[PDB]
Amino acid sequence: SEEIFTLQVRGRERYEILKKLNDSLELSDVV
Amino acid sequence: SEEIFTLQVRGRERYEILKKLNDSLELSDVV
Amino acid sequence: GSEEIFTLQVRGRERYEILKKLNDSLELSDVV
Amino acid sequence: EEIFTLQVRGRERYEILKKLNDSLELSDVV
């Protein structure tokens, strides 16, 4: 199984930063 | 109104890294 | 004891800016 | 591109930012 977690964020800039990092980790992780 | 953005994250370890970063970013008034 | 400060090297201005925002936030918040 | 520096206080803080930087070097998202 996999688990999807929800992280709630205030402030567009905060959200945009975290989205870029999430996207990067999706692509850099071995799986 | 205040917009709360949702960041969907696969996996506990990935979530915990991003949550730590969010913990910091939410304390920062100017990002 | 003492404190260690590490030089993080980042390629590219836009990548530098995102990591700078994070580091600046961490310096204030001290969450790590 | 140029390489820029950021001074990072403390090993654990350096390690989290290094993890992100290394990820970005692999993914090229930013």
Author numbering:
A (entry chain D), B (entry chain C): 301 to 331
C (entry chain B): 300 to 331
D (entry chain A): 302 to 331
Paper lines:
To see whether the C-terminal helix of the zebrafish p53 tetramerization domain plays an equally pivotal role in stabilizing the overall architecture of the tetramer, we created a deletion variant comprising residues 302-331, DRp53(302-331). SEC-MALS showed that the truncated domain remained tetrameric at high micromolar concentrations, with the tetramers partially dissociating at low micromolar concentration. We determined its structure in three different crystal forms grown at different pH (5.0, 7.0, and 9.0) and ionic strength, up to a resolution of 1.0 Å. In all three structures, DRp53(302–331) forms essentially identical tetramers with orthogonal packing of primary dimers as observed for the full-length tetramerization domain. The last turn of helix H1 partially unwinds in the truncated domain, and in some chains, the C-terminal carboxylate group of Val331 folds back onto the tetramer and forms a salt bridge with Arg314 from an adjacent subunit, thereby displacing Asp229 that normally interacts with the arginine. Analysis of the salt-bridge patterns in different tetramers further revealed that Glu326 (Glu349 in human) can adopt alternative conformations and in some chains interacts directly with the guanidinium group of Arg314. This observation of fluctuating salt-bridge partners in the truncated zebrafish domain supports molecular dynamics simulations on the human protein, suggesting that the stabilizing Arg337-Asp352 salt bridge is part of a larger fluid salt-bridging cluster that includes Glu349 (Lwin et al., 2007). Taken together, the crystal structures of the truncated domain show that, although the second helix forms additional intersubunit contacts that stabilize the tetramer, it is not essential to the overall assembly geometry, which is stable across a broad range of pH and ionic strength. In contrast, the packing angle of the H1 helices in zebrafish p53 is not significantly affected by deletion of the second helix, and the truncated domain has essentially the same dimer and tetramer architecture as human p53.
The tetrameric transcription factors p53, p63, and p73 evolved from a common ancestor and play key roles in tumor suppression and development. Surprisingly, p63 and p73 require a second helix in their tetramerization domain for the formation of stable tetramers that is absent in human p53, raising questions about the evolutionary processes leading to diversification. Here we determined the crystal structure of the zebrafish p53 tetramerization domain, which contains a second helix, reminiscent of p63 and p73, combined with p53-like features. Crystallographic studies on the zebrafish p53 tetramerization domain then confirmed the presence of the p63/p73 signature helix in p53 proteins of a subgroup of bony fishes, providing evidence that the last common ancestor of p53, p63, and p73 also had an extended domain with an additional helix that was subsequently lost in many modern-day p53 proteins as a result of divergent evolution.
